[PDB]
């Protein structure tokens, strides 16, 4: 704020305090596995090549 | 809000702020009640206008607000609104002797008698002219003395007013003279007497048959000096059977309210009472 | 500035009024000003057919019991109390319905107080009277009563014409100014309320200062 | 939750304004009313 | 467009300086062909660093 000795009016009011809310905004993607690369996947039958 | 700060066009010599710091504490009025004015409409000078009626004038700055000049120290002079309460100095330019136990109300200045008319600060169009503090039987004797002014004259020549009035405009109240320049007949003048015709054909009406013959039986009764003024008051145009206590109840309390309505044109409520006075009679330290 | 008590008794917004009972034990009876309203006869039909609807009670009965047993005296019996800080409850030592509100100026002087007036209408069978709540500039008594007997002149008409057609029937006044405090130019705002689930015209004074008056009798 | 956290400070001195201005720090303005600086000139 | 954009709440004034001492101010950001003629257009403030 400046200030004048006129006769317009100053505030009084400094460090006006706010509070602001967030709003949410959430992200999804899907991923698929099939059963038969899950199942090679673990069980290693240990064999050949 | 409570400090009021004011200006001029011209600026202030060491010559004009010397007599304007002698005006610390003294009453100044205010048309508008805002926080930064104009010197073109403090005082009073914007609002005088001979041969338009004293009586305008003490209908309108009975409207301004007040307040009282302190602390000046160039282009700054800050009148001060009093709050409703609080123990203020004041100072009066109006030549009337004070008394501790008398009240307050501001008039308009009238003229004195010496053609001084002191002004105490001209400027090249504008002069400060300052409301009277003057004690209350001064004002209920000036509102009632110009209302005399106004009800008698209806209906006369110029000559037997003058005869009267030129005696009638002179106050002697503590070893003073004074005068009522200007109670001209206007429309103000018209509904205050109007409401006074009123308010007294009420009180001839609405009042006891009892009432009416009370000096009558003083008069046939008792000898004093004031029952021989009342006797060659009302002598020239010259058992109780009927008894009502409540009805008299109700009459005496429309008396009251309608002797009150006629009392309401001379009675200002008051501006200003006195807790002391300086001996030399200069300031005041009162309450409002 | 708060001056609080407590007071034997859903807006901030109302004026405690303290009539007096004729009936013998409460002695008094505290009356918001609302309910002047349902008395007055400047008002709308509409708000008054709904007051009349919402606030039927047995005191609402022994109000009319006891406001209608003495014509022209209500000004004995009216008495303030200031606004309320919440509502038992207490009351301070602002919400007005939209036609008992009136101005006559062009409401554009800056610090402005406020006055009740109430008027007594006698041209018909015995009294009706009016409510008004008076937004005005002027600060002193007697210029406000000649702008009052400019603006009521047929009410003092009234006066003088039951004074002369019934002169066993004393009158005491044709009404009361009284102000109550000061409300700035820019907070007073035309406005809107719902209580209780119904529709009401209503303008509200914001920042009032609390400042009571005295209830000077006029002609 | 937050307040004004993002001011700068200004100097009198340090603004490009300066250059029209002689500084003078005087501690007795307040009684001052007026200060005047007077010049005699003859003409040639 | 720059300037009337007013200025953030706070600032880590470490963060987003480049070299030799200068301070970013923001980011502005379009598509492709946008930038064409942006680069195309302005091509002696543009400094890759």
């Not at chain 2, 015709?197 to 009406?205: E, P, R, T, W, Y």
């Not at chain 4, 100097?11 to 720090?25: N, V």
């Not at chain 5, 004034?13 to 502005?28: D, E, H, L, N, R």
Request: hydrophobic fraction near 45%.
């Amino acid at each position: 704020r400046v200030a004048s000795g006129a006769g317009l009016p100053t505030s009084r009011q400094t460090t006006i305090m706010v509070t602001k809310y967030s709003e949410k905004s959430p992200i999804t993607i899907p991923f698929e596995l099939s059963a038969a690369c899950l199942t090679y996947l673990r069980e290693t039958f240990e064999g050949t090549i | 809000e409570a400090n009021i700060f004011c200006t001029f066009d011209h600026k202030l010599s060491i010559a004009d702020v010397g007599k304007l710091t002698k005006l610390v504490a003294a009453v100044v009025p205010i048309p508008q009640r805002l926080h930064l004015i104009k010197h073109y409409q403090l005082g009073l000078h914007q609002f005088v206008d001979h041969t338009r009626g004293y009586v305008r004038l003490r209908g309108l700055l009975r409207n301004m607000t007040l307040t009282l000049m302190r602390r000046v120290e160039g282009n700054q002079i800050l009148l001060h609104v009093p709050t409703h309460g609080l123990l203020y100095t004041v100072l009066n330019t109006g030549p009337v002797t004070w008394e501790k136990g008398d009240a307050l109300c501001v008039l308009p200045p009238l003229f004195h008698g010496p053609l001084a008319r002191e002004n105490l600060l001209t400027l090249g169009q504008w002069e400060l002219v300052l409301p009277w503090i003057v004690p209350m039987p001064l004002a209920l004797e000036i509102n009632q003395r110009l209302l005399i002014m106004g009800l008698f004259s209806l209906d006369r020549s110029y000559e037997e007013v003058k005869a009267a009035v030129q005696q009638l405009q002179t106050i002697t109240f503590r070893d003073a003279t004074f005068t009522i320049p200007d109670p001209v007949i206007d429309q103000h003048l018209l509904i205050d007497m109007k409401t006074a015709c009123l308010s007294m054909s009420m009180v001839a009406n609405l009042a006891s048959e009892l009432t009416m013959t009370y000096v009558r039986k003083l008069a046939l009764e008792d000898s004093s000096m004031l029952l021989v003024k009342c006797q060659e008051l009302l002598m020239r145009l010259d058992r109780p059977q009927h008894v009502s206590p409540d009805d008299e109840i109700a009459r005496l309390s429309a008396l009251f309210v309608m002797l009150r309505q006629l009392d309401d044109l001379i009675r200002e409520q008051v501006v200003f009472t006195v807790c002391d006075v300086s001996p030399d009679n200069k300031s005041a330290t009162c309450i409002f | 500035q708060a001056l609080t008590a407590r007071f034997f008794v859903a807006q901030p917004g109302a004026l405690l009024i303290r009539m007096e009972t004729g009936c013998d034990s409460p002695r008094h009876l505290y009356i918001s000003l609302y309910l002047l309203g349902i008395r007055a006869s400047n008002v709308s039909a509409s708000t008054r057919c709904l007051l009349e609807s919402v606030y039927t009670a047995s005191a609402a009965r022994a109000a009319l019991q006891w406001l209608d047993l003495g014509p022209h005296l209500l000004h004995r019996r009216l008495e303030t109390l200031g606004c309320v800080k919440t509502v038992l409850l207490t009351c301070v030592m602002l919400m007005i319905p939209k036609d008992m509100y009136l101005t006559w100026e062009e409401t554009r002087g800056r610090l402005q107080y406020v006055y009740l007036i109430i008027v007594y209408d006698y041209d018909g069978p015995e009294t009706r009277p009016g409510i008004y709540v008076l937004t005005s500039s002027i600060a002193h008594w007697q210029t406000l009563v000649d702008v009052a007997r400019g603006k009521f002149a047929r009410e003092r008409c009234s006066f003088v014409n039951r004074r002369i057609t019934r002169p066993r029937q004393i009158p005491l006044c044709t009404g009361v100014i009284q102000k109550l405090g000061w409300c700035l130019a820019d907070d007073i705002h035309t406005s809107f309320l719902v209580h209780k689930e119904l529709k009401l015209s209503v303008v509200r004074l914001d920042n009032f200062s609390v400042e009571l008056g005295d209830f000077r009798e006029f002609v | 939750g937050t307040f004004c956290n993002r001011l700068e400070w200004v100097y009198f001195l340090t603004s490009g304004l300066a250059a029209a201005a002689h500084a003078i720090k005087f501690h007795d303005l307040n009684k001052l009313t007026t200060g005047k600086m007077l010049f005699h000139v003859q003409v040639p | 467009l720059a300037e009337a954009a007013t200025d953030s709440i706070l600032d880590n004034p470490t963060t987003y300086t480049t070299s030799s001492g200068a301070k970013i101010s923001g980011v502005m950001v379009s598509t492709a062909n946008v930038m064409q003629i942006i680069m195309s257009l302005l091509s002696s403030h543009i400094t890759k660093e």
